[PDB]
Symmetry: C2
Subunit: 291 residues, 2 copies
Amino acid sequence: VPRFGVQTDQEEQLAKELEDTNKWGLDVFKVAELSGNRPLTAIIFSIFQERDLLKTFQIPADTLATYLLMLEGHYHANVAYHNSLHAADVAQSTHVLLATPALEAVFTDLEILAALFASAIHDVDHPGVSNQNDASVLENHHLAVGFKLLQAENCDIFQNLSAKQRLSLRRMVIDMVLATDMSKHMNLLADLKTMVETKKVTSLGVLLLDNYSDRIQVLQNLVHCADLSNPTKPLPLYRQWTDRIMAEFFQQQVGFIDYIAHPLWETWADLVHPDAQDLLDTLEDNREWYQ
Amino acid sequence: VPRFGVQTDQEEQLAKELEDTNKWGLDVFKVAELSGNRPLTAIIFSIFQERDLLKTFQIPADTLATYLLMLEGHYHANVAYHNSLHAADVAQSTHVLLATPALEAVFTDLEILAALFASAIHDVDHPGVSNQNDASVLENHHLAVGFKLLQAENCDIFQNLSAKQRLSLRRMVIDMVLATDMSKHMNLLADLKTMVETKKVTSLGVLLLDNYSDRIQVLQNLVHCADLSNPTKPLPLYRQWTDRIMAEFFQQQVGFIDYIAHPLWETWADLVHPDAQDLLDTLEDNREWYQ
Ligand SMILES: [Mg+2]
Ligand SMILES: [Mg+2]
Ligand SMILES: [Zn+2]
Ligand SMILES: [Zn+2]
């Protein structure tokens, strides 16, 4: 099994680029190229190794590679934005958000594993916005696909988790992937604002979420924020995401930053102040049309 | 009837801004504000007056105002991108493309009127990309709505056109609005490339389209280009369009510039060389992620 589960000629440059795995400014587009166009597999391996998750949950390296290669293969490369690169970006953003100082020692390794897995499969088999009941049918499909692939030969990365752990993780993953459904945005934001107003921090300045009910609300918002993190990334990266979104948009009052991204990121920023101010500053920069 | 069919307090600044009606860089967002949020009505009046179309086709000023106010009212303000501002922008872009030196004296006043009308109604009553037979059902709906509004009291702006002219214009309008259906993009581009290869210019350097069959192909591509002109506009404007598209996108290989906008604009540029090189230069600037 290759260093990052992927086979590439420029494995040297790939490793160097992946040194920014813990950074919000990671150039995932560069990772995509250097990984032989397998950003998701490379990113998840880099993240898992960084968090020592393979050893913690006894996830066989070859099993992870096989599952990821198969998962990444179920994202449609012809779909401009909702492809494995977006999945890799969301997982990596989730990884950094989880490492926020304000959330230190708040989540268990299982909750962390669930958030990263959810991020990895959250848009799998997306057919494209123009080709997409009324109860998160699409997000439930992403979950179904992400889960079914675990049943393939040598693909069950959770084989060494107890039944109790699998039940917990499955439930959390479902909750987080369903939280990426934009129709749930307004209600999720309301919940987050409530978490902010009733926030409680220790003397060390760390959030206090002793109750699971509160933990899952934060985790849902965290992954939702990761999914909507494009505008908080450096302009060069944001413009590339924007170019992809427009291609998918055209494939066969008003404003994204003002009405969707800002209200959400400002609230998240309040939850972890001062940890996310840099993101708001970047958002503000990207909002300056004439700058 | 007000100077531009719309009632506003800053009519003074509106007139000044509309002095750029013949310019590709027009700040339509500014026009929207200065017109009391009625960009389409203001822009069409400015264009029609500029081309002296009201006198040419005896279009009563009050009739035009009533029709436009009603048409603009059928665009959904809550739809982030596909609203009356996009319609105004496409009509104004069509106006400038038609004035291209290479197309001087090529089209009749009726063909010009049809192209501008088509641009004005081309997306009317659009419900938003996430809320949108297989034969341009949506574009045919835009046409149905645009046409039905002409039947309202004092709304028939074509009342003074002969039956022969109405038949011709109706046919051309249908052809141009259907040409905005992205599923027809590839075939339209093929047609345009054929128009380019078999191009014929006079000694004065003006295109020769003596045959209607060729005229309609160029007109269809012209309005299609107008609909896809966002990336050829100055970055500040492009970023605002992009922000609107992303909001609509999220409302409940790969790349827009590289695979959709460039192949089309390069072909158009060949048709009218050197008239549109500035647009390609701007497109190139907007394609520089790190610039
Ligand atoms: Mg999704
Ligand atoms: Mg349209
Ligand atoms: Zn997503
Ligand atoms: Zn349009």
